[PDB]
Amino acid sequence: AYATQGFNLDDRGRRIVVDPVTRIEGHMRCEVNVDANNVIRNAVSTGTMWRGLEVILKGRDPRDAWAFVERICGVCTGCHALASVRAVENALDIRIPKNAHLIREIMAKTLQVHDHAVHFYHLHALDWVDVMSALKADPKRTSELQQLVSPAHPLSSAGYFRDIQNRLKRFVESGQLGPFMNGYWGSKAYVLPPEANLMAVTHYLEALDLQKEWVKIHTIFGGKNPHPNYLVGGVPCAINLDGAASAPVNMERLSFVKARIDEIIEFNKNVYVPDVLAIGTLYKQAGWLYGGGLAATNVLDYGEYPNVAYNKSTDQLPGGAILNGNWDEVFPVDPRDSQQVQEFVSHSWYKYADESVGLHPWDGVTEPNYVLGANTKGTRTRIEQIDESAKYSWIKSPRWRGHAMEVGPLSRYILAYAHARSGNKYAERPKEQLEYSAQMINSAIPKALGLPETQYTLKQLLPSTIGRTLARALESQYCGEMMHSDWHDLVANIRAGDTATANVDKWDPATWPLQAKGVGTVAAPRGALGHWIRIKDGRIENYQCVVPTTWNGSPRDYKGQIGAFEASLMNTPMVNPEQPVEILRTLHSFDPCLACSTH
Amino acid sequence: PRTPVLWLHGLECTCCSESFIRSAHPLAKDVVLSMISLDYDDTLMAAAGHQAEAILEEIMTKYKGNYILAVEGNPPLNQDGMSCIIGGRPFIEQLKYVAKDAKAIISWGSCASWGCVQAAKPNPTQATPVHKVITDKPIIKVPGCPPIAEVMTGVITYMLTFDRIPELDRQGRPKMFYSQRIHDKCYRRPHFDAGQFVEEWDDESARKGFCLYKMGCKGPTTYNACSTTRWNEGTSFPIQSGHGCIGCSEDGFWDKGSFYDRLTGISQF
Numbered sequence: 079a080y081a082t083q084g085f086n087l088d089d090r091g092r093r094i095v096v097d098p099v100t101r102i103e104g105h106m107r108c109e110v111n112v113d114a115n116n117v118i119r120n121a122v123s124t125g126t127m128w129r130g131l132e133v134i135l136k137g138r139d140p141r142d143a144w145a146f147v148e149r150i151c152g153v154c155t156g157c158h159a160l161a162s163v164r165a166v167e168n169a170l171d172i173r174i175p176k177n178a179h180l181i182r183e184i185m186a187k188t189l190q191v192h193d194h195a196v197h198f199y200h201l202h203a204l205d206w207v208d209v210m211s212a213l214k215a216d217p218k219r220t221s222e223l224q225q226l227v228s229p230a231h232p233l234s235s236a237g238y239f240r241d242i243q244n245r246l247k248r249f250v251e252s253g254q255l256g257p258f259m260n261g262y263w264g265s266k267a268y269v270l271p272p273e274a275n276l277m278a279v280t281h282y283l284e285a286l287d288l289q290k291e292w293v294k295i296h297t298i299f300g301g302k303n304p305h306p307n308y309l310v311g312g313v314p315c316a317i318n319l320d321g322a323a324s325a326p327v328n329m330e331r332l333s334f335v336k337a338r339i340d341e342i343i344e345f346n347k348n349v350y351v352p353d354v355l356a357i358g359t360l361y362k363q364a365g366w367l368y369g370g371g372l373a374a375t376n377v378l379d380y381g382e383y384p385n386v387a388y389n390k391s392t393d394q395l396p397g398g399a400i401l402n403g404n405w406d407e408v409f410p411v412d413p414r415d416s417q418q419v420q421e422f423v424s425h426s427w428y429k430y431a432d433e434s435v436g437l438h439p440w441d442g443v444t445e446p447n448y449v450l451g452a453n454t455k456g457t458r459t460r461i462e463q464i465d466e467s468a469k470y471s472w473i474k475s476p477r478w479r480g481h482a483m484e485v486g487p488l489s490r491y492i493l494a495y496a497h498a499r500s501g502n503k504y505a506e507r508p509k510e511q512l513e514y515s516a517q518m519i520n521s522a523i524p525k526a527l528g529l530p531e532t533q534y535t536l537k538q539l540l541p542s543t544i545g546r547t548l549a550r551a552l553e554s555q556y557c558g559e560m561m562h563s564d565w566h567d568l569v570a571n572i573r574a575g576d577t578a579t580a581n582v583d584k585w586d587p588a589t590w591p592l593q594a595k596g597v598g599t600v601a602a603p604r605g606a607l608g609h610w611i612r613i614k615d616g617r618i619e620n621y622q623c624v625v626p627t628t629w630n631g632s633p634r635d636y637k638g639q640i641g642a643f644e645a646s647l648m649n650t651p652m653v654n655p656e657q658p659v660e661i662l663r664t665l666h667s668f669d670p671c672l673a674c675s676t677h
Numbered sequence: 678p679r680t681p682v683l684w685l686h687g688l689e690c691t692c693c694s695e696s697f698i699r700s701a702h703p704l705a706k707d708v709v710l711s712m713i714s715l716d717y718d719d720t721l722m723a724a725a726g727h728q729a730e731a732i733l734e735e736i737m738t739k740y741k742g743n744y745i746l747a748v749e750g751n752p753p754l755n756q757d758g759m760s761c762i763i764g765g766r767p768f769i770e771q772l773k774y775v776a777k778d779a780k781a782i783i784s785w786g787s788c789a790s791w792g793c794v795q796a797a798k799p800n801p802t803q804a805t806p807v808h809k810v811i812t813d814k815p816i817i818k819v820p821g822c823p824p825i826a827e828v829m830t831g832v833i834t835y836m837l838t839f840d841r842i843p844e845l846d847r848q849g850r851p852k853m854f855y856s857q858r859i860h861d862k863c864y865r866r867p868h869f870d871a872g873q874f875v876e877e878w879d880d881e882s883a884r885k886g887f888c889l890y891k892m893g894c895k896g897p898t899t900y901n902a903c904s905t906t907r908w909n910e911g912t913s914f915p916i917q918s919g920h921g922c923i924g925c926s927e928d929g930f931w932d933k934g935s936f937y938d939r940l941t942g943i944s945q946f
């Protein structure tokens with residue numbers, strides 16, 4: 079047992095194992111220890127997969143890299159391609175044309191919306207929503223709840239909810255529960271009334287049908303989803319309005335994109351955000367404000383979406399680092415600085431010459447070393463209880479100037495709030511969303527549901543599993559609003575006569591410097607993404623990825639500091655230590671992508 | 678009663694699972710609620726840990742020789758198999774256990790079919806396709822990174838309607854979706870036939886939709902439904918949106934040279 083970052087870690091209590099962690103991307107094992115009152119007093123995050131993309135890339139052409147690294151992950155599909163082309167362009171001093179910038183931003187914001195909304199409904203919702211309780215709901219009361227939660231959502235009739243309920247009833251009465259089989263239904267950890275559960279299940283089905291429309295934006299610009307195509311120097315989707323039906327992008331295609339964006343705006347505003355505000359209100363009322371972990375102290379993002387291309391002071395999700403819960407001081411984050419972003423492997427299944435130091439990714443090393451500690455229960459190929467005192471994960475340990483940080487939408491929203499309070503005008507919208515959300519959660523929704531009004535500040539509400547879930551929904555909404563503006567800027571630029579989509583001046587490697595290094599960063603759906611590349615004689619010399627779930631899911635560092643997942647689980651009571659409802663609820667609030675984390 | 682599907686995940690990126698839920702005809706919602714019983718799937722299932730693993734036992738017993746095993750991703754043979762761990766054990770052990778009583782095995786995507794990106798040189802985990810590990814069961818390969826959504830649901834729909842695997846080619850792919858090369862019906866083919874090619878990105882030729890062969894298009898050597906069925910309810914495909922096919926449904930496509938290097942012997946095609 080030891081203390082770190084204000085957490086008193088203690089492994090003497092009852093050990094609980096969750097393997098597999100489900101409703102995530104990829105493979106994770108989680109172990110906790112609980113005290114005599116079922117409160118988590120130790121948590122262990124184990125990434126249970128590795129593929130070795132960084133190793134595979136060595137010797138290949140930098141122009142091909144985006145497609146390899148895109149296949150790090152099909153959920154956050156394209157964000158790695160974006161990081162890669164940015165890294166190569168940075169190495170080779172390539173400036174992309176305005177239309178390519180705007181198209182990439184539209185693609186990025188489409189991914190944010192799709193990823194966030196699908197995560198919440200299809201992966202996260204079942205930690206908050208009891209589907210069996212939905213069967214007991216009254217359709218008229220569900221209709222009335224829907225009208226209170228979101229007046230503008232037109233799918234609100236009692237008959238509609240009754241039809242959805244009857245279909246769920248028939249499914250369940252078949253005896254083949256499928257994805258609902260052996261669930262934790264009826265646990266006291268679930269607090270929603272039946273009507274709220276039926277509303278949420280209805281929206282789960284609505285989101286499942288609608289999500290396939292949103293990604294058609296990727297299909298137009300990138301050919302396919304998942305895994306749209308990218309290009310070093312711009313985009314491949316050449317523009318021709320008249321000369322034209324044969325060009326990748328004409329006015330009809332752009333009109334189609336705008337129709338899809340408009341639908342997204344409606345979904346975020348009428349379905350997703352109101353649902354999260356409502357569910358968050360009801361769990362707040364139950365007192366479930368656990369899960370803050372590192373969000374209460376240390377948050378980081380690289381900053382993204384500049385109002386003016388290549389001008390970072392105009393980032394609409396402005397970044398930096400906050401330490402020790404001091405929201406009055408945002409430190410600048412420089413991905414080029416060797417003393418800032420570093421990765422340790424002290425408790426990871428890799429080898430460095432000296433594991434007491436962290437490597438900046440331009441000097442990163444990925445040599446596997448699968449070995450289990452002396453206190454392991456089980457064998458090398460049959461683990462019963464992992465030994466977190468030794469190496470226990472395929473995830474490296476990223477730190478910022480040695481500090482353990484949380485990344486993600488919550489981090490970006492805390493940073494945006496801090497920036498806005500310091501006078502940054504580019505952060506006004508996320509600040510407004512937060513203030514609106516706090517008022518809804520504290521007063522308006524409680525007043526509408528006949529519950530007591532509360533007075534939580536953003537300082538109190540945001541660093542919590544509820545807050546983390548809320549920030550994701552708000553970010554989805556903001557991203558939809560931003561790409562709506564980007565579309566207008568794109569069409570205006572094309573109509574003014576600039577149709578350029580690629581800079582090919584340095585396409586041929588005979589034009590390249592004989593060596594170069596570059597970095598590309600992205601505000602990916604789950605947080606701060608970076609790719610660092612070294613090029614030599616036209617080939618990849620080194621390629622290192624530090625990915626958002628690498629930060630959040632990281633195991634302990636050389637100093638024994640815990641990462642965001644482990645910190646978030648600490649000090650949480652479990653209704654039943656053998657039903658991982660609370661573990662799943664909090665882990666899922668980070669939207670863990672394990673293929674991303676390990677690559 | 679709906680046929681149980683046990684959908685396992687090895688080393689993967691999850692693109693095939695995501696592609697599956699893009700299906701418009703049929704809707705994935707209707708597949709899950711009314712066509713199959715999706716009883717195990719790490720991506721979507723409510724149960725975790727011990728409760729999740731208990732499902733495999735139950736379904737294999739009750740539906741012995743009458744469930745479908747779908748596999749996304751692949752097993753690693755290096756690191757003693759523990760570069761992919763499930764329930765504290767190598768994934769390959771789960772794969773072999775569930776495969777033994779399956780009536781049919783679907784290898785979803787290039788990972789399960791052939792190896793895909795993790796099997797590209799130097800293959801640090803010795804990632805191995807399903808058919809090299811499971812050698813005594815009927816397998817259908819549905820390659821592509823990911824496969825087209827309607828190809829995935831088209832395969833499931835066939836298997837459920839007929840209780841049969843559709844006719845396969847020599848490589849184990851369904852002829853109903855993989856009989857044509859992209860180049861056969863690619864809408865840019867008249868340009869190829871007239872020697873009309875893009876030579877640099879965003880040149881005049883690119884703005885007129887000229888053929889992408891000289892920019893590295895692997896359509897002439899790649900079998901898939903992308904030129905006809907197309908992607909995301911027939912919205913586009915890679916070539917329509919201006920990038921050459923990179924060959925993503927073909928075995929070993931990551932190690933066939935740069936995606937931007939053209940095929941040699943253009944007269945072959």
Ligand code: SF4
Nearest residue numbers: 863866888889894896
């Ligand atoms: S080479 Fe590619 S772009 Fe050209 S006709 Fe063939 S498949 Fe179409």
Ligand code: F3S
Nearest residue numbers: 901903922923924925
């Ligand atoms: S890259 Fe793949 S998606 Fe189709 S067009 Fe080529 S087989």
Ligand SMILES: [Cl-]
Nearest residue numbers: 442443444445
């Ligand atoms: Cl290395």
Ligand SMILES: [Cl-]
Nearest residue numbers: 531532533534
């Ligand atoms: Cl209060």
Ligand SMILES: [Cl-]
Nearest residue numbers: 791793928929
């Ligand atoms: Cl392959």
Ligand SMILES: [Mg+2]
Nearest residue numbers: 474622623624
């Ligand atoms: Mg890395």
